[PDB]
């Protein structure tokens, strides 16, 4: 997750940071199968979309960064710090 919020902040400019994609082998090994992991990104200014797929009919799920957000880049870096400072 820390990952996906520096990737965008690295290379605003570049629209393709802005989407993580739900079914990414690394995202559904990593996110998906911990409980509360989508209300962090929603929380921090994610919306849950559906988008079309580069190679098949069937829409996929992202979580895109919202231009609120992204016009704000010490959000996410405040919430990234948060999420990695904290404990069980």
């Given amino acids: 997750i820390a990952k996906y919020l520096d990737n965008i902040h690295l290379h605003p400019e570049e629209e393709k940071y802005r989407k993580i994609k739900l079914q990414n082998k690394v995202f559904q090994e990593r996110i998906n199968c911990l409980e509360g992991t989508h209300e962090f990104f929603e929380a921090i200014g ?43």
Avoid: I, N, W
């Fill in 46 to 88: 994610f919306q849950k979309v559906l988008l079309p797929a580069q190679d098949q009919e069937d829409p996929e799920e992202f979580y895109v960064l919202s231009e609120t957000t992204l016009a704000q880049p010490q959000s996410l870096e405040r919430h990234k710090e948060q999420l990695l400072a904290a404990e069980p």
